[PDB]
């Protein structure tokens, strides 16, 4: 389900824009190369679809590739060497995770559009150059902190991204009520809105599966009754926090107590991938008076227990 790519059709914050819409206006005040744009903030938030759309309001296609998805140190070279049209965009997701050097043979495409390939056997010889076209690079990171090496220099503008309010996400959801055979109401949709932890991603998950479900196609309609009904019901979860989350807490609080544990044990007692824990569950929890990371280990905030 494609969407008419624009910026006027982009549900979301107006800050990065106050300092990007402006440079988006520079690609028409100077040339086509709009400084390397890195992206921060938590997942879902909207990264791809941003520039995936930015492109069209620029005049060039878009090529996007995940970082770690780079074995051959020349896979990007190939992603640079003939495949563009003097403007196309190259998006690099999970960019912070690139080969020790792969990220070094990435600076050439910074100053302008080169890709000088050092070479030598002993004693090393000269150094080869190519002719990568002029393009705009988007390299987003899910966890920038201190993993986006000095390459932050080569990147043009560094703007952050955060969660898009119950309103904004709920807002989107509305336009998402015009899909294929379903009408939902606002206030209701507001329900959904706050269960999509400030994330469009978790803002459609709920329904996507709802599709192929028995007792939901007969009552297709969805108003603030079904909204919070087949949501608190078999949509299996109250305010965001869902099954596995309850389970977590349940084990966090019941087995261990409100006491601290440490990804160490807990991730195992939860029979889970420690990384996958603190990374794909622990998140929302914390950012919602629930989970607390302590040098002693995780712990349950009161508002968790009484909450159930």
């Amino acid at each position: 389900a494609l969407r008419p790519k624009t910026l006027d059709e982009y549900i979301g914050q107006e800050r990065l824009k106050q300092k990007l819409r402006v440079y988006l206006e520079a690609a028409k005040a100077r040339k086509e190369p709009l400084e390397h744009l890195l992206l921060f903030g938590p997942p879902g938030l909207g990264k791809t679809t941003l520039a995936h759309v930015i492109a069209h309001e620029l005049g060039v296609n878009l090529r996007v590739t995940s970082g770690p998805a780079i074995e051959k140190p020349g896979d990007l070279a190939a992603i640079l060497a003939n495949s563009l049209e003097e403007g196309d965009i190259l998006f690099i997701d999970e960019i912070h995770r690139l080969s020790r050097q792969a990220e070094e043979h990435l600076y050439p495409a910074m100053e302008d559009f080169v890709m000088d390939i050092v070479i030598g056997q002993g004693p090393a010889a000269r150094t080869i150059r190519l002719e990568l076209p002029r393009f705009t690079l988007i390299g987003a990171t899910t966890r920038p902190g201190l993993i986006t090496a000095p390459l932050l220099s080569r990147f043009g503008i560094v703007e952050h991204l955060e969660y898009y309010t119950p309103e904004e996400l709920a807002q989107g959801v509305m336009r998402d009520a015009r899909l294929l055979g379903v009408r939902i109401t606002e206030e209701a949709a507001l329900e959904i809105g706050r269960r999509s932890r400030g994330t469009m991603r978790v803002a459609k998950r709920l329904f996507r599966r709802v599709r192929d479900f028995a007792q939901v196609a007969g009552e297709e309609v969805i108003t603030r009754e079904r909204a919070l009904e087949a949501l608190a019901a078999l949509g299996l979860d109250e305010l965001g926090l869902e099954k596995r989350d309850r389970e977590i807490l349940e084990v966090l609080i019941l087995r261990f107590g409100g006491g601290p544990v440490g990804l160490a044990t807990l991730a195992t007692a939860l029979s889970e991938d420690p990384g996958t824990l603190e990374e794909v569950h622990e998140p929302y929890l914390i950012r919602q008076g629930l989970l607390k990371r302590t040098p002693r280990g995780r712990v349950a905030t009161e508002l968790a227990r009484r909450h159930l």
Binding site: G74, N82, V118
Partner: protein
């Protein structure tokens, strides 16, 4: 007719030297520079230039096609002979002389043994523009763009052969292939 020759440097000289190609001891004049970088005993190739006369035949040798080129071109002008052309060639480097000849530095020409005042001028006005395609910089090929291609490829990941084995096949379908246009086009078939 005779343009090239291989033989020993049998014996050198002030402004000449003898090439024992075949069984014949040929005697040719050359530019001092070239002349000096010449050592009796070692084989050598010479870009020659025959020249009839009314008393005998003359041979003029040169380091490389470039030089020979100028020497002729030079002789091309009315009034300039082998001596002069030679001087000029013996004085300033070809490249610089090629430019000069094109542009018309009767000033720079004079600035050289056989320093001709008005002659440097004639020679100038006379070849202004009339000089030269591939002659502003001594033709010299760098590295085997082919291999060079590969060499890059290898260092970019691709196991050597994998890369070489398709660089060749590329030069096949397309002999003209700067490492660049060659290399890239490999990534394509190496996806």
């Amino acid at each position: 007719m005779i343009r090239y020759l291989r033989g020993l440097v049998l014996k050198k000289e002030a402004g000449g030297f003898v090439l024992l190609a075949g069984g014949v001891g040929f005697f040719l004049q050359a530019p001092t520079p070239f002349l000096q970088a010449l050592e009796e005993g070692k084989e050598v190739g010479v870009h020659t230039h025959l020249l009839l006369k009314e008393e005998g035949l003359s041979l003029y040798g040169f380091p490389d096609e470039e030089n020979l080129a100028l020497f002729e071109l030079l002789l091309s002008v009315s009034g300039v002979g082998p001596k002069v052309a030679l001087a000029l060639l013996s004085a300033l480097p070809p490249r610089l002389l090629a430019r000069a000849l094109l542009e018309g530095d009767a000033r720079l020409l004079t600035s050289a043994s056989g320093v001709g005042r008005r002659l440097a001028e004639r020679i100038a006005l006379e070849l202004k523009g009339k000089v030269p395609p591939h002659l502003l910089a001594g033709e010299k090929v760098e590295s085997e763009a082919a291999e060079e291609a590969v060499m890059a490829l290898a260092a970019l990941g691709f196991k050597e052969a994998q890369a070489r084995a398709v660089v060749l096949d590329l030069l096949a379908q397309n002999p003209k292939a700067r490492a660049q246009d060659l290399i890239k086009e490999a990534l394509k078939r190496l996806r």
